[PDB]
């Protein structure tokens, strides 16, 4: 349904990545190394 914007099919191709909020992908504190440990999603978006 193209009544509303974003109903265009071209919005269904990955152009913008909505990087999630920090609370969605928490970074643990003092894990192994005194340094904070990040997580899989943050690592993947860094690589992207």
């Amino acid at each position: 349904d193209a009544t509303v914007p974003s109903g265009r099919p071209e919005t269904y191709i990955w152009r913008y990545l909505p990087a999630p909020p920090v609370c969605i992908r928490p970074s643990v504190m003092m894990q192994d190394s005194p340094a904070s440990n990040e997580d899989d999603l943050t690592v993947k978006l860094t690589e992207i």
Binding site: S6, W14, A19, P20, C23, P26, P34
Partner: protein
Amino acid sequence: DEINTAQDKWHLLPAFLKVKGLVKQHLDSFNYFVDTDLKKIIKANQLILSDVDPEFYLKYVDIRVGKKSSSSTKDYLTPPHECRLRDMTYSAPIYVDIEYTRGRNIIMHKDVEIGRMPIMLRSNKCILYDADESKMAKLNECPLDPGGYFIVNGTEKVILVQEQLSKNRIIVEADEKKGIVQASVTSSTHERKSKTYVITKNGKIYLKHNSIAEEIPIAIVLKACGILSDLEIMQLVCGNDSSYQDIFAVNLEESSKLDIYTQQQALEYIGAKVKTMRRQKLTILQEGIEAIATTVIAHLTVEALDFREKALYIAMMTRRVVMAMYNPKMIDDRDYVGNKRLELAGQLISLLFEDLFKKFNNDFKLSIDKVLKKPNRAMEYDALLSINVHSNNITSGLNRAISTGNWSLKRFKMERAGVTHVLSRLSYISALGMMTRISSQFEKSRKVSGPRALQPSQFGMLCTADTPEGEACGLVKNLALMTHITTDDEEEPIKKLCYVLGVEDITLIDSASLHLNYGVYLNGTLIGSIRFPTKFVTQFRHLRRTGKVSEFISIYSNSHQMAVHIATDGGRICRPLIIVSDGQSRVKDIHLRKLLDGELDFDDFLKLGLVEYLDVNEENDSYIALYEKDIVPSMTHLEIEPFTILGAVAGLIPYPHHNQSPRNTYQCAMGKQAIGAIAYNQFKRIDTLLYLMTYPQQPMVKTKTIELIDYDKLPAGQNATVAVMSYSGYDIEDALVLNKSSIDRGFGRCETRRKTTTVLKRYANHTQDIIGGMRVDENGDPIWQHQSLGPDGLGEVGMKVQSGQIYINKSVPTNSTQYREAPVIYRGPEPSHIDQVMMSVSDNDQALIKVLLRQNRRPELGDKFSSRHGQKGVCGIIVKQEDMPFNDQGIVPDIIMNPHGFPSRMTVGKMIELISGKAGVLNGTLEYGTCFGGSKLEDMSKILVDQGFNYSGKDMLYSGITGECLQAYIFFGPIYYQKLKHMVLDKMHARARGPRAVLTRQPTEGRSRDGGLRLGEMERDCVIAYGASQLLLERLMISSDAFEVDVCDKCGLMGYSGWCTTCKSAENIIKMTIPYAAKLLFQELLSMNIAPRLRLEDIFQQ
């Protein structure tokens, strides 16, 4: 009194256990490894060469563990208990002799240490070997410890015995609506493969290998293996039987349907389908590639121009297929005990060390190439500095594999886990039963109960009662009391013997007559045929009884499949039987008299041919008598003692043959959790958790097994005075009535000891943690947090620690000069007492503090007890002694157990135990409840009557609360009761509010972290079925995750601070409460390209 063969042949069991202990599979496997398998690995990987500098080589000459040639004594090993205390590894160094060439033509030996070998306890290399309990006391070791495990980084790890299907044997399996496949998982010394062998359609037989692209027609492969007459193919795989001819003839047509064949044509066909070899030796891609395809199709490597051996192997493969085609039930049970092998810790470690040494050699040669790639001044002197450096990887990987249980083997290429487990220290029987435990192969499709059922073929090999509960029911198995695991014997000394005994080699036999006489198979391989298979088998068994061949080699004949089978491989479970000849047993109690007097140990019964080991397969050819009185003139063997069909743990049960089997299995479970005595050095031990009974008693009714395993030396339980009666109504449903003032006098009194370990670790900035502290108040007294802390900052031995107090005052540097407090705080509902503070260092020069916290425990309401018969229960009520029923002498039961637990569970063994224990206490003698035996009930009744008690153990009691005679006679007597490790003090949990997982903003998951209880899908469904919408809301949002989100009414997107931050207006933002799980899921959906816009309406306005 003269020896009677019937009731005195059981002494063969203590004789056998004297030299072949319960923990002997591990011990023999490790001893064989460190004595010969190390030599074999060193000789296989003996010479690493370099492409550069041909006038240079490195030769591994000898390998030795823990001993040098400088002195006759061995090297000083850190004692295993010191390793346990210091959190290090009980290991001995590996030494090799190195022949490395010098630049000036110098030949020399050496004694080079290339790493550390984690030593099994009580092995040949262990310091506890043949220690006389005085050396054991000096080394702080219990003389009753099983041994057979490893101490890696202070942790006792046991490499569990592994079940697997036998390799290099044909297994035929059928199916419904799929067809018939039969496989041969063939494992060579360096490559493992499964020559799978399937039928596709039209009764057409195909060969399906991993390397081959598509399944090859069987006639093609049979012609490729030299068998190319195409009438002998059908003669070999069908013989003279008309049915098999018709079943097999279809795939003779497809042999010519493509084109008629020579050997080399089928060779080229099969070689066309080879997949790849990582693109090395590409110029072999011709008819020559089929040669490697066929030679690496199985374990029958062909090293000449004759293919008859592999050809006949494939032919019998096909013939088994064809018999299964003609009828099912010609397949073989995959759960048959004879079709499984037991691999042991020595074999595991041998293969792991092979991989580690291969890696070590590869990296050493890389270092050699890097050193010798320099053009000039390539001095040779001290070419072993690198080996001094590089020895750490062998030690590191060898320790890590045992510590973690994960075994990453690159050469063989599987990743298996759970090889090792932390040794159980709940009880002495817990440790002993953790040894002799077997884990079965995974990937089994646990949805079925196939490899879960008890098989009759495990009789006397695997305990029929010691199986776990819950999830590993029938998968984890245990060794029977009197068993042996065969070792590998070389088969070429005995193929020659088979030829001597009349076997004609398959190279002298024609195909037409092959199925006319019996074939002879050596480890699954048809080596020849023979006339008179019965006479051949008899001659072989005589030759083994006279010691001319290994007593572990098994010979048996198959009538349905015309085949005499000889097995020499290791991993086969076997047990000794008395040989019965001509209707008579061969022991005849002159040997028993000699055995008891001191001569003729168990091995001499094998040397004289009185006993012999039988594996599961020879038992098919045997006919065993259970007893002497049923020796009929057709029986081949006689049971040494039939109660050995139960394991070590199941031997704790008195009169198990009088119980329902689930009760015996449940007692096998409970005895491992019973609280008792751990070891003679249990107060020297500092374990993570240790429950100890204050006043353990040996059972009044014991068995032969418990005295064979020395359970009466470290018993876990007490002989409670028990009245079996309904009482007080607090004993319904397994619940027990415990006597107050029996608890007061120490009945069921135990304690728990818990260790906490902290390391003062040094840091790269040359800083480290410290344990300074113990700040005082102005009056001089320490603050309450430091009441029991001592000047050194470590809690004082003997002092009580309440919850919140510090017993390790550790300070951590803030730039790991300034120290932030990280003290170890006691978090316990009940106070503990510091009973031990150990200060030491580890092998890596780092401070190590271990504090032992002990805590006395009174049996309270809800604590669990059991009675050796699967009758467990919690304390329902604790009653005053004067409220208890009493007998004429004033005897008051310690425990009252409900009679309602008996009729449905049918633990008659428990009643017999009560009567036998009562007779034993009145007579002064400990009674026996041995399986299939024990003390007769009538003799116990005679003792009871002769002492003035009722023959059936029922006494007239008076009520303790009314004083009147109870109208029924009460079953009254002693029963051994075990207090189990499940105390309500460690189970009582209650959370109001507290820690939350930040990701989901929900309460945490564990009683340790003060977590909440999960209201799952099923509870939600129950609440829905009640129709309680508000309770649903309160439990699943209000009391779990209630987030006050901001929702824009225009676009259903969540905002913050009443701000749409997408419409940037804040006019349409409204406020509502949703689960934080819903908030998180919406935000995660927005992370993908899914926008779950919320549409909102007013609750009101009707």
